[PDB]
From a paper:
AFF1/4 is an intrinsic disordered scaffold protein that ties together the other components of the SEC. SEC is composed of the positive elongation factor b (P-TEFb) including cyclin-dependent kinase 9 and Cyclin T (CycT1/2), the transcription factor ELL1/210,11, the scaffold protein AFF1/47,8,10, and ENL/AF9. To release Pol II from this pause, HIV-1 trans-activator protein (Tat) recruits the super elongation complex (SEC) to the TAR RNA.
The crystal structure of human AFF4-THD was determined by Se-SAD, and the structure was refined with native data to 2.4 Å resolution. Only one molecule of AFF-THD presents in the asymmetric unit though the AFF-THD was eluted at a volume consistent with dimer from a gel filtration column. Most residues were localized clearly, except for the highly flexible loop from G1045 to S1082 as well as the very N- and C-terminal residues. The α1 helix, with a highly dynamic N-terminal loop standing out of the ring, packs along α2 in the manner of a helix–turn–helix fold. Together, those helices mentioned above constitute the tetratrico peptide repeat like domain (TPRL). α5 and the N-terminal portion of α6 (Gln1087 to Asn1102) sticks out of the TPRL domain, which resembles a handle of TPRL domain and is referred to as Handle Region (HR) hereafter. In contrast, AFF4-TPRL contributes its last helix to fill the hydrophobic cleft formed by AFF4-TPRL, a novel protein fold. Though only one AFF-THD was visualized in the asymmetric unit, analytical gel filtration indicated that AFF-THD is a dimer in solution. As shown in the model, the dimerization of AFF-THD is mediated mainly by α5, and α6 (Ser1082 to T1107), as well as part of α4. Our crystal structure shows that two hydrophobic cores, with Phe1014 and Tyr1096 located in the centers, respectively, mediate the formation of an AFF4 dimer.
Residue numbers in the entry:
A (entry chain A), B (entry chain A): 903 to 960, 965 to 994, 995A, 996 to 1045, 1082 to 1158
The structure:
Amino acid sequence: RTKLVFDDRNYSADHYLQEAKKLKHNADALSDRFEKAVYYLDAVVSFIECGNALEKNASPFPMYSETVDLIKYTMKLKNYLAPDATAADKRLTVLCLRCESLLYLRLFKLKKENALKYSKTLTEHLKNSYNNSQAPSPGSVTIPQKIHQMAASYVQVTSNFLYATEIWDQAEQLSKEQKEFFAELDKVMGPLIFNASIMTDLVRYTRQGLHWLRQD
Amino acid sequence: RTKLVFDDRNYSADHYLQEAKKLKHNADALSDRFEKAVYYLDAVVSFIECGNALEKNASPFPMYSETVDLIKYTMKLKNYLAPDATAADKRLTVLCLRCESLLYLRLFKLKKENALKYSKTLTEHLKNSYNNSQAPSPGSVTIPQKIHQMAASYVQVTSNFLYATEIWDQAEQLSKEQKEFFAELDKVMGPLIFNASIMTDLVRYTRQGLHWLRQD
């Protein structure tokens, strides 16, 4: 067993993008699904590195979103639920799901401000509009279109961590099935922490796991 | 320094409630704010223990919600932002904010199912209702009241982890100001993990911190 030693020379968001694109076009031009997915996942981490480098001198939202799309494509390659699925396929899938979960959670986190005060005004008006459509009794609803767009966007950015939570839990569950591989990987890297691991932690974790997979 | 040894005999949700209520009525009848808050926080953990015991033979939602209310009351006692605020006040506040954060996150988590498919239907209709209020051009909005109630509830349960995230981050920030006390507490208990620590982990963590505070 060997641990990657990691270069601290942080580059420009541009450098990681041609890295990612090259790994990805390397993936695009190969036969064996497994092979493809590995390179796709390597491409993915370079894409993540690029987004991280955007966040250093401030927007990474599009880059991250499209990266989660490339992760779903990749997972649909050697589907871990297939009955022939190998341990390698399942470990690959786990790494994919960690990247996808924490990516979703970052996509959210970029719009946390929006989400919070949107929640305030929305809670207020989703009571005003309702109290005003019901004639009192002594003894469809119509909303301002601003309120409507604010509802649309609130659901938009809250969806991202609904996905993050659910996918995080799939990663944990499927990880129990490769308890040893991921026990050792958590040993040498430290385990990923939902809400605490930054993008560089994820990048290195994923790189190390990809390294062991390519070594078999 | 001494670590509490913890009793594994899990009791009924009823047993913890009269424990909590007794600690709380002990708090209610004392002068010194600090004193009060300590007992309030002890009351709180018994209240949490009670809610946990509800979850064992399946609803803890009300109990948890009202407990977070007792936590905000308690924090409004020796406000850590006061200029006379002691290290003890600040540590107490940190413990309060962990309980409040993870309580919010559980309140959410109880309704995760609701939230997810609500997100689906809401995203669809928040496009149907909008595409149908805008006359096309070749070259306020009205919604079903079911959709309206679903929007209200979706915002309701997503608010809970918006709070959980924000309060979690306040706890981290204020924790940097008592880095050593909480470094040692994480040492002997293991640190609380957002999204991973279960209620019993929180109970024991908080109990241990309360123990050191009462020892000064």
